[PDB]
Amino acid sequence: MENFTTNLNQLARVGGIDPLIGREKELERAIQVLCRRRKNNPLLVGESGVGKTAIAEGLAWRIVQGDVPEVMADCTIYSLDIGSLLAGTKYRGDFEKRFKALLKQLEQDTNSILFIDEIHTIIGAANLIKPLLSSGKIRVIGSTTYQEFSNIFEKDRALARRFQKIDITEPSIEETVQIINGLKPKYEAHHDVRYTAKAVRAAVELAVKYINDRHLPDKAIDVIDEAGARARLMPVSKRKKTVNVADIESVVARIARIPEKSVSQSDRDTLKNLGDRLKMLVFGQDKAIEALTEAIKMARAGLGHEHKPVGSFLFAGPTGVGKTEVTVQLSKALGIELLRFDMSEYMERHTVSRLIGAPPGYVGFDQGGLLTDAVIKHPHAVLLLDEIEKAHPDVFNILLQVMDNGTLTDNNGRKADFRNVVLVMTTNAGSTDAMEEIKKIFTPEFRNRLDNIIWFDHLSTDVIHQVVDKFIVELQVQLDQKGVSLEVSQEARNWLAEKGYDRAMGARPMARVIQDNLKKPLANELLFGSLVDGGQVTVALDKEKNELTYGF
Amino acid sequence: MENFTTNLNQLARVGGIDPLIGREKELERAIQVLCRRRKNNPLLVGESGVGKTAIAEGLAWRIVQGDVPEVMADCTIYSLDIGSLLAGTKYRGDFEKRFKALLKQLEQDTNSILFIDEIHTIIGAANLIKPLLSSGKIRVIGSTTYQEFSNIFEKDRALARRFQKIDITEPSIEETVQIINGLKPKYEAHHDVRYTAKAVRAAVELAVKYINDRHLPDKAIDVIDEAGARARLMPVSKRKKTVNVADIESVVARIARIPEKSVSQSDRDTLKNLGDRLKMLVFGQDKAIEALTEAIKMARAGLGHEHKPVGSFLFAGPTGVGKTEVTVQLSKALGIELLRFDMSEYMERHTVSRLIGAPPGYVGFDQGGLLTDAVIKHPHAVLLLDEIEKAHPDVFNILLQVMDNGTLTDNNGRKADFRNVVLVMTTNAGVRETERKSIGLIHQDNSTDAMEEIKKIFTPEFRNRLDNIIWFDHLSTDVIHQVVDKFIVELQVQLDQKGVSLEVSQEARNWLAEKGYDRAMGARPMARVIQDNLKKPLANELLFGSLVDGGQVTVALDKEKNELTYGF
Numbered sequence A: 001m002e003n004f005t006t007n008l009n010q011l012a013r014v015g016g017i018d019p020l021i022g023r024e025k026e027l028e029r030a031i032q033v034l035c036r037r038r039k040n041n042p043l044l045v046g047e048s049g050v051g052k053t054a055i056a057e058g059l060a061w062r063i064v065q066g067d068v069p070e071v072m073a074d075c076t077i078y079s080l081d082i083g084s085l086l087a088g089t090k091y092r093g094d095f096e097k098r099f100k101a102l103l104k105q106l107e108q109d110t111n112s113i114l115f116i117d118e119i120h121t122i123i124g125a126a127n128l129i130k131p132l133l134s135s136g137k138i139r140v141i142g143s144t145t146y147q148e149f150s151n152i153f154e155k156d157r158a159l160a161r162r163f164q165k166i167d168i169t170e171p172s173i174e175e176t177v178q179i180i181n182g183l184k185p186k187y188e189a190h191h192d193v194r195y196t197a198k199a200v201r202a203a204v205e206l207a208v209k210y211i212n213d214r215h216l217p218d219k220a221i222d223v224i225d226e227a228g229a230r231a232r233l234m235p236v237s238k239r240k241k242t243v244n245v246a247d248i249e250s251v252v253a254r255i256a257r258i259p260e261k262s263v264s265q266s267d268r269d270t271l272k273n274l275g276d277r278l279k280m281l282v283f284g285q286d287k288a289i290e291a292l293t294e295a296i297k298m299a300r301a302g303l304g305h306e307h308k309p310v311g312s313f314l315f316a317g318p319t320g321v322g323k324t325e326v327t328v329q330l331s332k333a334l335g336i337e338l339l340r341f342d343m344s345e346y347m348e349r350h351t352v353s354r355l356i357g358a359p360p361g362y363v364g365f366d367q368g369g370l371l372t373d374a375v376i377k378h379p380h381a382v383l384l385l386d387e388i389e390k391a392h393p394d395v396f397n398i399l400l401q402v403m404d405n406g407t408l409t410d411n412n413g414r415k416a417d418f419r420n421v422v423l424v425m426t427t428n429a430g431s432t433d434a435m436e437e438i439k440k441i442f443t444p445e446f447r448n449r450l451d452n453i454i455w456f457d458h459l460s461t462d463v464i465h466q467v468v469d470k471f472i473v474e475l476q477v478q479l480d481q482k483g484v485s486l487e488v489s490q491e492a493r494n495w496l497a498e499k500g501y502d503r504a505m506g507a508r509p510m511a512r513v514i515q516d517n518l519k520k521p522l523a524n525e526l527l528f529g530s531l532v533d534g535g536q537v538t539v540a541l542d543k544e545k546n547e548l549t550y551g552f
Numbered sequence B: 001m002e003n004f005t006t007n008l009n010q011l012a013r014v015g016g017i018d019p020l021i022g023r024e025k026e027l028e029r030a031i032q033v034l035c036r037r038r039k040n041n042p043l044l045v046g047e048s049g050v051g052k053t054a055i056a057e058g059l060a061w062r063i064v065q066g067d068v069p070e071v072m073a074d075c076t077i078y079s080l081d082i083g084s085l086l087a088g089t090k091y092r093g094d095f096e097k098r099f100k101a102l103l104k105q106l107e108q109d110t111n112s113i114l115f116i117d118e119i120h121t122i123i124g125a126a127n128l129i130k131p132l133l134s135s136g137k138i139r140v141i142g143s144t145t146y147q148e149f150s151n152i153f154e155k156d157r158a159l160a161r162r163f164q165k166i167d168i169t170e171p172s173i174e175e176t177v178q179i180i181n182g183l184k185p186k187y188e189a190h191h192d193v194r195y196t197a198k199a200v201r202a203a204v205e206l207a208v209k210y211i212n213d214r215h216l217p218d219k220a221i222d223v224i225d226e227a228g229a230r231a232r233l234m235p236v237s238k239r240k241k242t243v244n245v246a247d248i249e250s251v252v253a254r255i256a257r258i259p260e261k262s263v264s265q266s267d268r269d270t271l272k273n274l275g276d277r278l279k280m281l282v283f284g285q286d287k288a289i290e291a292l293t294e295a296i297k298m299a300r301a302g303l304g305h306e307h308k309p310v311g312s313f314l315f316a317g318p319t320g321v322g323k324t325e326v327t328v329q330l331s332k333a334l335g336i337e338l339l340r341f342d343m344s345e346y347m348e349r350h351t352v353s354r355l356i357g358a359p360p361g362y363v364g365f366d367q368g369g370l371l372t373d374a375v376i377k378h379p380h381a382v383l384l385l386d387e388i389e390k391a392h393p394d395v396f397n398i399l400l401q402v403m404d405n406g407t408l409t410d411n412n413g414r415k416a417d418f419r420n421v422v423l424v425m426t427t428n429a430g431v432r433e434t435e436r437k438s439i440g441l442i443h444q445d446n447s448t449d450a451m452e453e454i455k456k457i458f459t460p461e462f463r464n465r466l467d468n469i470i471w472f473d474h475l476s477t478d479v480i481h482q483v484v485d486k487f488i489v490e491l492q493v494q495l496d497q498k499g500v501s502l503e504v505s506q507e508a509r510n511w512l513a514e515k516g517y518d519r520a521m522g523a524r525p526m527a528r529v530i531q532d533n534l535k536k537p538l539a540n541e542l543l544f545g546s547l548v549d550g551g552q553v554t555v556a557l558d559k560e561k562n563e564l565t566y567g568f
Ligand SMILES: Nc1ncnc2c1ncn2[C@@H]1O[C@H](COP(=O)(O)OP(=O)(O)O)[C@@H](O)[C@H]1O
Pocket: A018, A019, A020, A021, A022, A023, A047, A048, A049, A050, A051, A052, A053, A054, A179, A183, A217, A218, A221, B157
């Protein structure tokens, strides 16, 4: 095996192997398994990036250090390269020849162990070692995921009985702190930096909160190494080597595809003026913004509940008052995604399965869910549900279980975390009369689970003028990107506000009115070339025409 | 030896390497990745020829200029030229002994970084770089594309725990112009010609609508090279060093073989008169054509949302009135391709997955979905989705997502550009309700408005995003007469090619037109009725001795409303 495997004893004795911390229980289990006469083959069951490989390295380290029982001494752990072993054969006899050469070079040392990292690729071959590792001469250290184990193992019972499953789980928060503490000095030596304990704990907690593609002990080490690299690059500004919590938050936002610094302390600057910058983007219903921002700050302060969503908000009031506008601006401010669903399509009995997914064996199972799928895709978004009072009661039971426990289960068994989303529900139901109306239509078991009910009052005529001026200034800045100025007379604004607004529809027709009255005429003048770079658009209302006139 | 490992730092010092234009944040990412103690091997994923070698050359140059932290300020970089070590052996043992020799040589050359061009092809002598992975003390920068990345790296833990993908996107228009200007003086020296900044500007602005082979910073330079070569070679006695935008469009017409006058010399002229251009080829539906042209013009004006698609229109009304022909002539007028899909085949979600390119449902998910690859091939084309009311509601979800954001990502790390695509769907829903016979003694009882059935079929979430909803009316008697006359002249061409002349009375044309027109299918049964009423008796005569090689047949009607055949 001179060219097929790596002598891990020769490697832990020189360097590169890092000390394994907090795995005394699993190491003892692997040792106890290795002391058996027959079937002394440990199998490490875990997931990607949990430190399965670190177990074998720590075992080789304790071997070369002598921190093992004397029965376990003198053993040599070999890590084979499957690239050299399996690939490049291309014929019916070469792979078995390589395999038998490896087995013979293992036979000369009856106390040596072979460790095959990720042993699910060589198996599906496997019938060549089942009689060798059954009870005869060879002990093998296996490392697989739970999925690869439950898929390839447990089917070949002859191989399931020839291996000892060692349940490697991901370490807890404090164990991650201890592991990264033990691993700190090496990165400090490489990057010539220093990590504060506050930065360490913050990095672990932020990796848990935002980075959900890997598991704890590896993504945490990755974020510290990345912070160390960033602080080693910072001498382009000739800064100090200390790595604080700010660098950790920056690198976290860099990695989790999250807006920069939108995680811990710039959030203080945003929540300082959250209600204000909302009231500059939404007009009217300002007490609604006040209560909503109050609840948002209440949740962000760390005083909320972990087994409930960030907030369960009901937006009661007539349409066109900006509930969706409040929601989308809340999403844009906090740098979180937006999830939008309309319960108009889930009012039927059979439609409920579209959210979580059909049970196995039925149509649309491999489609998975839509709610749980989006939530797993974007765990920090704000959930928007239009017309909740239309949803079929099964959707209401789903939402009840969500608001009560803050987690959902995909039809593939995955866990959808809702503790980081803001559950926002809007209705077009709508004061005390609106409250009594809400008591009717909504079951008390649902209302009792709500965080806060937010009422949206009717839009006032000055507010309609303000929103039409908002449309006008948006069109103005859009034209300024083109380079054409625009004038709109006051009576034109009043006519647009009165014509595009309905008490029963709110400001919804305002987009259509703005478009068909302003963009069309101006688009003709601009594209056909009558109005060019340097013109100024005028808007005049004639009561004898009720139309808008213009010029160059 | 040095014939296998090339230090490009010397190339940067001797002026052989120019500084890189832009993409400095990719340099910073690569540097901080090379700074790591573990997983310190950068990987460049992206399109082929977008400046990955250029990124590495600019990074090595910056190290020469010392634009890096003090840890890698003195480090040297090496480029791997596999061909030199590979060729000249033709012996597996010699191949492997050369591999060992180069491994020992680079290990002696420690404290250096080796750049592997197209590492995806080196990994798949796969046992040549595995010594570098097992050693780990050597940093390596590679280059790969999304296809090869998804094929090799995402399934291998030994590679994932070493490499980090650097998503290199194609630069903006102005960044491409900056790169063109940076590479311009040496080519002006080589090609002995002079191009303006407006010349290369119109060059890239034309390439973006001619590019169907490779992205921006891999083709505009080739356009410039072709322009220089032609301007130096096209005239024998003249040497037109002045290379203007007319020269660029001449090269575009010379290479793409589309007439420069139809695409490059017409920027807005056909757009300003698009409506009459369509009305000239489609008989009738003038109101629908006018509405469509006004909508697409309002879109082209640019006073809207740049992310949204060019146009999203639902063509309602009975089929067989030319809505597909309207779309065909719209595609031909804009000079853009026609990407069409008959939504009758996507009534099942396991086919919607194939439409998008979801991993399950279809083999070959490395190539992505149909719609995404199609819009990638032509980011300027028109989209036709017939019978849109048949598609699965997930197609409606995707259409809502596109009409909301104007971009569709793929499960292979690619994006779809819709901001230059116009989407057109056709349906005939509700038109079946215009022929619903009432119960009363009169039972006309309606000129049905299919709008209610339309809003019933398409959820308000979807149709709320329509840029317009175009309604197509019934074809007029003159329109039906023109279309039956077109069928007639087609039959006449066929018969004269056979050698038989044909004549038809105008009354017979009116009869065929008024008989073959169905308010449910428009003029589609016209081909069939023309066939059954004309081609059958003429074929009977053509085979049974009345006419064999030549002859002439006239057509007329009786008082019984029957076709009358007149033989030789
Ligand atoms: N208890 C620990 N002590 C020291 N390092 C650890 C510990 N647990 C995990 N690590 C580190 O986290 C990383 C885990 O990588 P690894 O488990 O080998 O990947 P995979 O499980 O996918 O094969 C390693 O860098 C490892 O050193």
